[PDB]
Amino acid sequence: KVFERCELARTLKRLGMDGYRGISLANWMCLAKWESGYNTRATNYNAGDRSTDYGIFQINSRYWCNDGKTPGAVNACHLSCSALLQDNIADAVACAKRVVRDPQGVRAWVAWRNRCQNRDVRQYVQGCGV
Ligand code: NA
């Protein structure tokens, strides 16, 4: 499903993402925006290394979820990548929390560095009542 901005903002706060491992809600919104356009069904095949990015946070199959076709991959979130394509984002959120528990933190996603880091991200949560 494609979330509306504020709808997603409120959902993420209820799922405990605000300030998770030091990452503000506005940063998570900036990330979801640039990764999928707030679309839970988005997938991106990376022909270069044969891995696929899944869902709203575009989580990669090489380390986080299992899709069976990615060479030498692990499944740290202990989830089928299918779980990351549901309309209910609970599993995607639990996995995203797992990703940021690693040393890189939110820097794990290159898109965050390009379009969110050191920018004014307040705009993503403005007027949503969170
Ligand atoms: Na995997």
Q: Give yes or no for a contact between 49 and 62, defined as CB atoms under 8 angstroms apart.
A: yes
Q: DSSP letters of 58-95?
A: TEETTTTSB-S-STT---TT--BGGGGGSSS-HHHHHH
Give the experimental resolution in Å: 1.8
Please state, in angstroms and rounded to a whole number, the distance separating the CA atoms of residues 10 and 29. 11
Q: Give yes or no for a contact between 97 and 66, defined as CB atoms under 8 angstroms apart.
A: no
Kindly state the DSSP code that residue 5 receives in the 8-state scheme.
H
> Which method, experimentally, gave rise to this model?
X-ray
Closest CA to 73 of 86, 89, 60: 60
Centre of ligand 1 from the C-alpha of residue 51, in Å: 8
Please state, in angstroms and rounded to a whole number, the distance separating the CA atoms of residues 124 and 97. 20
Q: Give yes or no for a contact between 119 and 45, defined as CB atoms under 8 angstroms apart.
A: no
Domains of the chain, start order: 1-130 (1.10.530.10)
Please state, in angstroms and rounded to a whole number, the distance separating the CA atoms of residues 121 and 26. 6
Distance from chain centroid for Cα 127: 22
Checking DSSP bridges between strand 59-60 and strand 51-54, what pairing results, if any?
antiparallel
Centre of ligand 1 from the C-alpha of residue 47, in Å: 15
User: Other CB atoms closer than 10 Å to residue 7's CB: what's the count?
Assistant: 13
Centre of ligand 1 from the C-alpha of residue 122, in Å: 34
Q: DSSP letters of 12-40?
A: HHHTT-TTBTTB-HHHHHHHHHHHHSSBT
63-100 burial code (b ≥16 CB/10 A, e <16): bbbbbeebeebebbbebebebbbeeebebbbebbbbbb
Centre of ligand 1 from the C-alpha of residue 64, in Å: 6
Catalytic residues: 35, 53
Centre of ligand 1 from the C-alpha of residue 109, in Å: 16
Q: Give yes or no for a contact between 111 and 35, defined as CB atoms under 8 angstroms apart.
A: yes
Closest CA to 82 of 40, 114, 118, 115: 40
